[PDB]
Amino acid sequence: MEKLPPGWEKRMGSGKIEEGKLVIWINGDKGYNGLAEVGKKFEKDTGIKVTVEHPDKLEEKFPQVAATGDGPDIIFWAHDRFGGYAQSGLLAEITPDKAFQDKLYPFTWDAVRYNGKLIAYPIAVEALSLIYNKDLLPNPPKTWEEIPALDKELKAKGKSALMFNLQEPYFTWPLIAADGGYAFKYENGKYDIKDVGVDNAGAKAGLTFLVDLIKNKHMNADTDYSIAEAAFNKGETAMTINGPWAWSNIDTSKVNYGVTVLPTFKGQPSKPFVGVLSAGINAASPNKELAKEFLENYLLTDEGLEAVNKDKPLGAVALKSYEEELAKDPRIAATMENAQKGEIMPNIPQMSAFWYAVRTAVINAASGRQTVDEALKDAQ
Ligand SMILES: OC[C@H]1O[C@H](O[C@H]2[C@H](O)[C@@H](O)[C@@H](O)O[C@@H]2CO)[C@H](O)[C@@H](O)[C@@H]1O
């Protein structure tokens, strides 16, 4: 027998993030190449190489991988996941000086506050819009209710009315919330985790309309991000539902498209969840100063955001100076019109489970594995 030797816990350990460089995680639907260009700028000014990666399921991996040799110095995701990360102590506190704070809309900072700390930098405000083919559909529908009839008409030309991703609850949430579905009730400065609205009559009606759309063969339960994107970008479906990031690929397809208000349901506006794309610094990073310099002086500038935006559009950006130029874009006006009708996502730790529950519920209802009532009861 011997005592455990020095550094044993490091031999049995998961490693350490490398000092002297920057590793960034951002989702694969975002402008990671443009972000790498920013990285390149940072490198030639500082010598510090910036590596940008878009792993799959990064928002799920981060809490297991954060404090390991594979953890990134900087993580990008919509602000909803960050409260969970903060509670898990995964996030370094963010300390921008006053002059820097003033450069971003104050309400974007609020989106990245958890328990009276700033736990990330806000980048851009995101929301879904109805994206339509102006040649197939010069006047897109104002109501969800008229979509089945519109589909039948388009099927006579070997076309369809609507395809969008049915594997992520994010995309059908605007329908679910329209007549009163909600995640967590907000009452007096606080989210009440005991008051969940995925099971009420608004949610049910919304999800039922989706299920009927599928049953009546206006939509297919198996449609995902890729299938719906190809279909719209090839001119096979008249409308899709997506965010600003999706606009680059449509530009390339030379489909003649518009971005407009989502259709109403039961006379009520569709209420898409609003996400603020945010950048957090890893608590286990030994490069926190570099990360701060990168985010504040390279990314969050007119030149930095543009580089990313040109790769894949960001939405309404948190940086005032550059947003004034993006605000003129009709697609951004539409984006903001849809966001305004919806609601910002909660950032509470319970979001992650909420999302998984709602994801499961939609997939099961659409597949017929469960009725709407059974699925949403399970979720609640
Ligand atoms: O579907 C659940 C999912 O919704 C949101 O994810 C969005 C994200 O906000 C967008 O930036 C874009 O990448 O599409 C995603 C949906 O596929 C939540 O932010 C995410 O936490 C949640 O799991």
Author numbering: 1 to 380
What did the published study say regarding this structure?
In order to reveal the atomic-level details of co-translational folding, we determined the structures of a series of nascent model peptide with increasing amino acid length. For this study, we chose the human Pin1 Trp-Trp domain (WW domain), which consists of 35 residues, as our model peptide. The topology of the WW domain composed of three strands and two beta-hairpins, which form an antiparallel beta-sheet. The structures of the intermediate-length (WW11-MBP, WW17-MBP, WW19-MBP) and full-length (WW35-MBP) WW domains, which are fused with MBP at their C-termini, were determined with X-ray crystallography.
In this study, we prepared WWX, where the X-residue N-terminal WW domain fragments is denoted using the format WWX. WW11, WW17, and WW19 take an alpha-helical conformation. Two chains of WW11 in Form I can be superimposed onto each other with an RMSD of 0.22 Å. In addition, the WW11 in Form II can be superimposed onto that in chain A of Form I with an RMSD of 1.65 Å. This indicates that there is little or no packing effect for the structures of the WW domain fragments. The predicted structures of WW11, WW15 and WW35 are nearly identical to the crystal structures. Therefore, the helical conformations in the crystals are not artifacts.
